Design a binder for this molecule. Structure first.
Ligand SMILES: C[C@H](C(=O)O)c1ccccc1
Ligand SMILES: [Cl-]
Ligand SMILES: [Cl-]
Ligand SMILES: [Cl-]
Ligand SMILES: [Mg+2]
Ligand SMILES: [Mg+2]
Ligand SMILES: [Zn+2]
Ligand SMILES: [Zn+2]
Ligand SMILES: [Zn+2]
Ligand SMILES: [Zn+2]
Lengths: 95, 88
């Protein structure tokens, strides 16, 4: 995988441990640490022609920002879990 | 507000990187500044603040679409608005 892929993969389990446990400030810290690095990757790898899987992950991210802004923590947690599970699998397709 | 202060610090870091031509760092710092703005806004939320919040929303949507022309345009605009917000 590209070096940015290896970098992203390293943080994914920890985001899900935090989210599952309802450590929502930790989930947000870890996501925000990831934000520039997922976007750099997504631009280089997916661009304006993302696969439906990659695009669903990135739409999840957009919708996480919107939920968090609205304080809708139920949606922050649900979207974070679903988006994480898809990202983990996206980064395994070469497996 | 230490969030305000981090933002101010990051704005300066951006101007230092841009003076050196460290453009990957500029773009990275601009992206660090997105969640940090939202945290600030969600802690203090002015019309200008609201325009900055929308600028980040729109940058994100443009990036998700691959409209890097719009990412570039909106980022430039939003950066200036933040500088102005913290210059009052
Ligand atoms: C996970 C969530 C949903 O299940 O509603 C979702 C919908 C559309 C795009 C991304 C995520
Ligand atoms: Cl984030
Ligand atoms: Cl956003
Ligand atoms: Cl963004
Ligand atoms: Mg590791
Ligand atoms: Mg798997
Ligand atoms: Zn984000
Ligand atoms: Zn995104
Ligand atoms: Zn945002
Ligand atoms: Zn961003």
């Amino acid at each position: 995988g590209s070096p940015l892929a290896q970098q992203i993969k390293n943080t994914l389990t920890f985001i899900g441990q935090a989210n599952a446990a309802g450590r929502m400030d930790e989930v947000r810290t870890l996501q925000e640490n990831l934000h520039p690095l997922w976007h750099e990757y997504f631009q280089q790898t997916e661009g304006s022609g993302g696969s439906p899987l990659a695009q669903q992950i990135e739409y999840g991210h957009v919708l996480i920002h919107q939920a968090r802004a609205a304080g809708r923590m139920d949606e922050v947690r649900r979207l974070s879990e679903n988006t994480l599970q898809l990202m983990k699998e996206y980064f395994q397709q070469s497996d």
